[PDB]
Amino acid sequence: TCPFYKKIPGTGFTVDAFQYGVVEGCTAYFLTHFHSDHYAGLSKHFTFPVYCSEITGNLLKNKLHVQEQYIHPLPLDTECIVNGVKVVLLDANHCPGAVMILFYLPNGTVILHTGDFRADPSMERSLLADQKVHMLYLDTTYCSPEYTFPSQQEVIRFAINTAFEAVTLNPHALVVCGTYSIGKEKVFLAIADVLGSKVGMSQEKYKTLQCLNIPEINSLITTDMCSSLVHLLPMMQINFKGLQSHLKKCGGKYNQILAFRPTGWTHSNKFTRIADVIPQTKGNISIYGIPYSEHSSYLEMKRFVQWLKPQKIIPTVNVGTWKSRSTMEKYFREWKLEAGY
Ligand code: NI
Numbered sequence: 001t002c003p004f005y006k007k008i009p010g011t012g013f014t015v016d017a018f019q020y021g022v023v024e025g026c027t028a029y030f031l032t033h034f035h036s037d038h039y040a041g042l043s044k045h046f047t048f049p050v051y052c053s054e055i056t057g058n059l060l061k062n063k064l065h066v067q068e069q070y071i072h073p074l075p076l077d078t079e080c081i082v083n084g085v086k087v088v089l090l091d092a093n094h095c096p097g098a099v100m101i102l103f104y105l106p107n108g109t110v111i112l113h114t115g116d117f118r119a120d121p122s123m124e125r126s127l128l129a130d131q132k133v134h135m136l137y138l139d140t141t142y143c144s145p146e147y148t149f150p151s152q153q154e155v156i157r158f159a160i161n162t163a164f165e166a167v168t169l170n171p172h173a174l175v176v177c178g179t180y181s182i183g184k185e186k187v188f189l190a191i192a193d194v195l196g197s198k199v200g201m202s203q204e205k206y207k208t209l210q211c212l213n214i215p216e217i218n219s220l221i222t223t224d225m226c227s228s229l230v231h232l233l234p235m236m237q238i239n240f241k242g243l244q245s246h247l248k249k250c251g252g253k254y255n256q257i258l259a260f261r262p263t264g265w266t267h268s269n270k271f272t273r274i275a276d277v278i279p280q281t282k283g284n285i286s287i288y289g290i291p292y293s294e295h296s297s298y299l300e301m302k303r304f305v306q307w308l309k310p311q312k313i314i315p316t317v318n319v320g321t322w323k324s325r326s327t328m329e330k331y332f333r334e335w336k337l338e339a340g341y
Pocket residue numbers: 033035094116
């Protein structure tokens with residue numbers, strides 16, 4: 001059964017609610033982004049309206065085969081009326097196609113649902129600037145001060161310099177990048193760009209990338225592995241066993257692998273600066289874990305909420321334990337006392 005924090009009061013709308021069967025009284029289902037935890041339940045058999053970004057729509061149609069008559073793409077940054085209610089979709093700075101949703105309720109209440117997001121000071125100059133928000137449905141994935149990580153920009157710089165150095169020292173090294181879902185494409189695109197290569201990958205992954213509206217994409221990716229010295233592999237294969245195995249298939253073209261495993265936060269961010277990071281090594285294989293996050297740091301999230309000044313906050317992540325719920329309510333109260341709302 002559909003939890004409360006996926007329902008939108010005074011509307012017939014749900015958010016990210018495809019795994020509960022038919023939802024009693026839902027006339028339109030919103031999808032914030034194409035990640036498996038949020039889309040779970042959509043298929044060719046779905047026959048209710050789905051509202052989403054254009055990118056999320058290309059994915060539903062081509063990867064899940066949802067029938068075109070039920071896909072309703074909306075432009076960003078644009079007031080739209082859906083079943084008598086004004087809505088706006090805003091960029092969430094998460095993965096390609098990911099949105100937040102503003103709902104302007106018949107009774108005068110204004111609700112922002114963030115979906116999954118990486119809060120940024122640029123969001124302070126979107127359509128949110130105008131006005132009040134009575135309820136915030138907040139992605140609280142990293143709502144604790146111990147969660148610190150660098151900017152995306154610094155992490156890409158480290159990856160670019162690391163790869164360029166290794167291949168310049170050794171023209172016969174292969175670079176491998178792990179992936180399991182959409183998001184974090186900048187890691188493998190930036191490395192391929194500095195090395196003058198296309199990124200090689202499986203037919204299924206190429207298909208997914210082709211749905212993402214990345215300009216000049218045909219110039220950047222390929223299914224011909226032999227013509228590429230940056231390869232994409234499923235994340236689970238990014239280990240010494242998986243990588244040795246891959247090296248055999250390449251036909252004695254290469255004598256070294258350097259691989260990158262993009263992660264979220266890990267405990268070694270407590271102690272090690274991005275500059276100081278070092279790989280796990282076995283023979284001619286090296287593996288770098290790099291903390292490329294598509295979710296707000298604690299500091300980013302605090303800044304966004306203190307700017308927005310919402311009347312009430314409903315968390316959508318870490319809601320399963322009394323301790324988590326209690327801890328999150330305590331941070332929301334300090335933030336409110338500190339900033340004066
Ligand atoms: Ni997500």
